[PDB]
Design a binder for this molecule. Structure first.
Ligand SMILES: [Ca+2]
Ligand SMILES: [Ca+2]
Length: 259
């Protein structure tokens, strides 16, 4: 038995659901957060199944210097601690965003409120981010190879070579993205990741750069499946990842399936 399995067996509808099986509480972080600005921690309330892995999330833009994000409730309710951090769109760069993602994770492990800390398995951590924060997801995995998963969303990075990445990486591209075009960012990153790495690339049909900023069931279901498979080692979710998804919303999918 896998000690990290959480929640009932997944179904095609459960992975698409807006709210998963866990109820979610939040903790706002504004002080003692210099390495990442600030953020909101979303966590499962139920403790009877054991502790949870965590994902730090760096969005591309949040209005009015906010930190809440639709990923928080949608992912945390599937059994994860989700820490959505502040953004500075006009200044964020990938290496810095990678540092901030890791600072957010280290905050969770070392300084988070006891209600979060007691629910956290500090050994099972992941990163995800949008745009320069997606470039930062890649950067973070090189800085901290012990991470369990990385999800660069419409990632932007001048550095196209990621052959040193050791962390299972799922890149989501937006087909019509003109800010981080998939032909020169997402796909070159994906193809330079090692052939031996569990990896995937999902291109959203007709989508623009800002698609990850709005609730999107295709993003959510495969983000959830990736985090389950790699943060929780939960092979009940392999069935949704391999063979490659064929959803109508997907223009193209590439992977190193089977994992
Ligand atoms: Ca490189
Ligand atoms: Ca298309």
């Amino acid at each position: 038995d896998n000690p990290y399995e959480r929640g009932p067996d997944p179904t095609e509808d459960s992975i698409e659901a807006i709210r998963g099986p866990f109820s979610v509480a939040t903790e706002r972080v504004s002080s003692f957060a210099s390495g990442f600005g600030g953020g909101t921690i979303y966590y499962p309330r139920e403790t009877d199944e054991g502790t949870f892995g965590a994902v730090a999330v760096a969005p591309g833009f949040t209005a009015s210097q906010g930190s809440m994000s639709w990923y928080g409730e949608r992912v945390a309710s599937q059994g994860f601690i989700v820490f959505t951090i502040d953004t500075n769109t006009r200044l964020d760069q990938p290496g810095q965003r990678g540092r901030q993602l890791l600072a957010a994770l280290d905050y969770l492990v070392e300084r988070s409120d006891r209600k979060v800390r007691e629910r956290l398995d500090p050994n099972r951590l992941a990163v995800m981010g949008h745009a320069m924060g997606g470039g930062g997801s890649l950067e973070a995995t090189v800085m901290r190879p012990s991470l369990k998963a990385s999800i660069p969303l419409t990632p932007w990075n001048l550095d196209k070579t990621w052959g040193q990445v050791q962390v299972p990486t799922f890149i989501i591209g937006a087909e019509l993205d003109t800010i981080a075009p998939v032909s020169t960012h997402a796909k070159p990153f994906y193809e330079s990741l090692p052939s031996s790495l569990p990896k995937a690339y999902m291109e959203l049909d007709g989508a623009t750069h800002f698609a990850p900023n709005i609730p999107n069931t295709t993003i959510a279901k495969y983000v959830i499946s990736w985090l389950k498979r790699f943060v929780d080692e939960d092979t009940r979710y392999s069935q949704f990842l391999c063979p490659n998804p064929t959803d109508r919303a997907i223009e193209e999918y590439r992977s190193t399936c089977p994992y």
